[PDB]
């Protein structure tokens, strides 16, 4: 920018999107990566491999195409993340993928976080991933119990119209139950 | 000491003051002479052109310039002309003043490297070339043979 | 196709240059070889440029020289039309010569020595201290220029 000698960072570093030092360590395993990504409203989960002209996604799942299986609840929560993980994990298995390492991009390794929920899901789908159980949420929170109890302190529906008034961690089970047998795109 | 000892450009460039100390001051008094307040807004422009690459000790520069400008006082102390010596003695010179043992000499002076065809001196005058004469005396005190060249001046 | 003739001896000439002449089948002064005009061959002749004489000869000249100084891969046998016919693909020297010039074959391919050991130039050559453009005898020549030399060394 300033001169001939000026050093312009890599595009993905300018965009503040890729952490290249972590990327390298991640690529060390030689295994596919389980890209765990979030949005204000959604949660994405991809299984990326290395390629000649860039990464190759062999299997993915988005919290949106979750409804495609009977989801009638918000998609930017814990139960959502887990399921998207399990959904991507399954598609992953279908694709012949057996193991991967957790890439959480620029997110933070906070215990019980949605990225780890994503990881728990993918693992339960059958994917073999290097993990640590006590950094994961305690199942109930994954089910969405923390939100149901939060609506207990109601007075006003936590969900604007949406579905239910007291919410449903049960709707969570019905879905995980669904994903664990047959159905299309899995 | 003789010019013969330092007039050739056969040695490496030696100019890094960060690695050379005790370099003698230059004897060259000024580089801009005459009406330096004014810019080259003159009809005529003569130049003294060196005809061979050589090294010119600040010694010779000072003597050459003085003998030229000191003469350009055929026009007066505040005459209408401007005189310029464009070269500076960057090249540090040594002398081995033990015999050939540990002979890397000690800094004894400076010289300017001029390539054949460069102009060492440039004067600016109105149709009043006394300057042509100031240079017959100038190249008299520098090693090389020289060419007195006139540029803007088809007033022959 | 160019005709190569070594005009300067080996003494003092770079080794990598001598080896090149040798790769071109020339191992003595006045020895001549015929070389295709290819990139690979072009680089070689250029390197040897200062100790040789080269150029494209005329059909006639080549024929004169072939007849006068060509030899079998082994032996004395004179390479005349008959020899050419009874030993090569062609019917006579002219036929061979044409083929060489149009670079369709080579002296070896036809069982002939790659080298035309010429005679010293009758009347003397122009000097081995300067190139042609300077009145010498070194470097690339005119077809008319090469012919004179070759002919003088017939």
């Amino acid at each position: 920018a300033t001169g001939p000698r000026y050093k312009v960072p890599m595009r993905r570093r300018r965009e503040a999107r890729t952490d290249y030092h972590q990327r390298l360590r991640l690529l060390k395993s030689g295994k596919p990566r389980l890209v765990a990504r979030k949005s204000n409203k959604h949660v994405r989960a991809q299984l990326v491999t290395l390629g000649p002209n860039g990464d190759d996604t062999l299997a993915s799942a988005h919290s949106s195409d979750l409804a495609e299986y009977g989801w009638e609840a918000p998609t930017g929560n814990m139960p959502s993340a887990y399921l998207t993980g399990l959904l991507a994990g399954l598609r992953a298995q279908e694709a012949g993928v057996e193991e991967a390492v957790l890439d959480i991009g620029l997110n933070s390794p906070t215990p019980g976080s949605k990225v780890f929920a994503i990881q728990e899901g993918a693992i339960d789908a059958g994917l073999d991933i290097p993990h640590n159980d006590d950094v994961l949420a305690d199942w109930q929170r994954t089910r969405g119990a923390h939100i149901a109890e939060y609506d207990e302190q109601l007075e006003e529906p936590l969900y604007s119209g949406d579905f239910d008034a007291a919410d449903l961690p049960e709707h969570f089970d019905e879905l995980r139950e669904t994903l664990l047998d047959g159905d299309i795109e899995l | 000491k003789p010019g013969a000892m330092y007039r050739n450009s056969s040695k490496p460039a030696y100019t890094r003051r960060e690695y050379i100390s005790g370099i003698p001051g230059k004897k060259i008094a000024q580089f801009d002479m005459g009406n330096n307040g004014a810019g080259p807004t003159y009809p005529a422009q003569v130049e003294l052109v060196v005809e061979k690459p050589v090294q010119i000790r600040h010694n010779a520069l000072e003597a050459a310039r003085v003998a030229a400008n000191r003469y350009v006082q055929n026009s007066g102390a505040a005459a209408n002309y401007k005189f310029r010596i464009r070269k500076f003695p960057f090249h540090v010179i040594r002398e081995n003043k033990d015999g050939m043992r540990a002979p890397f000499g000690k800094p004894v002076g400076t010289a300017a490297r001029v390539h054949g065809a460069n102009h060492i001196f440039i004067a600016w005058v109105n149709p009043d070339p006394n300057v042509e004469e100031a240079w017959r005396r100038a190249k008299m005190k520098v090693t090389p043979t020289i060419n007195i060249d006139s540029s803007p001046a088809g007033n022959a | 196709m160019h005709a190569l003739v070594q005009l300067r001896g080996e003494v003092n000439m770079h080794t990598d240059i001598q080896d090149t002449l040798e790769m071109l089948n020339i191992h003595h002064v006045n020895h001549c070889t015929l070389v295709p005009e290819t990139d690979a061959y072009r680089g070689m002749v250029a390197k040897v440029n200062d100790f040789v004489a080269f150029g494209e000869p005329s059909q006639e000249t080549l024929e004169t020289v072939l007849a006068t100084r060509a030899e079998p891969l082994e032996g004395d046998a004179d390479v005349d039309d008959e020899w050419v016919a009874e030993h090569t693909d062609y019917d006579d020297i002219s036929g061979l010569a044409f083929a060489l010039l149009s670079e369709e074959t080579t002296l070896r391919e036809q069982g002939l020595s790659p080298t035309l050991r010429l005679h010293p130039p009758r009347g003397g050559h122009d000097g081995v201290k300067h190139p042609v453009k300077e009145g010498g005898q070194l470097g690339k020549h005119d077809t008319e220029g090469i012919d004179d030399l070759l002919e003088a060394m017939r």
Partner: protein, 95 residues
């Protein structure tokens, strides 16, 4: 030379042009090579590890097995046969 360390006279070959300055792309540090492949040896100034003796910069050897993640490249120094331990970060596919 005034000294005889490995980095003697390496100012050039081991420095980056101002613009290629800074951490290098991971893609080439992870590249995988097969035994028999020809690879050009060139240290990446930006990459500390996986290095070989500066003297071999410019060589083109033959991958013949690996040691850990590092590769074992056979080269011929002058007339001597040598095996060099080197990481992908410092190798490139010939052709």
């Amino acid at each position: 030379p005034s000294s005889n360390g490995p980095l003697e006279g390496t100012r050039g070959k081991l420095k980056n042009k101002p613009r290629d300055r800074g951490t290098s792309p991971p893609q080439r540090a992870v590249e995988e090579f097969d035994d028999g492949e020809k690879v050009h040896l060139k240290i990446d100034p930006s990459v500390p590890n996986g290095r070989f003796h500066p003297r071999f910069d410019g060589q083109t050897g033959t991958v013949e097995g690996k040691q850990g993640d590092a590769y074992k490249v056979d080269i011929v120094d002058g007339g001597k046969e040598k095996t060099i331990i080197v990481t992908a970060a410092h190798l490139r596919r010939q052709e």
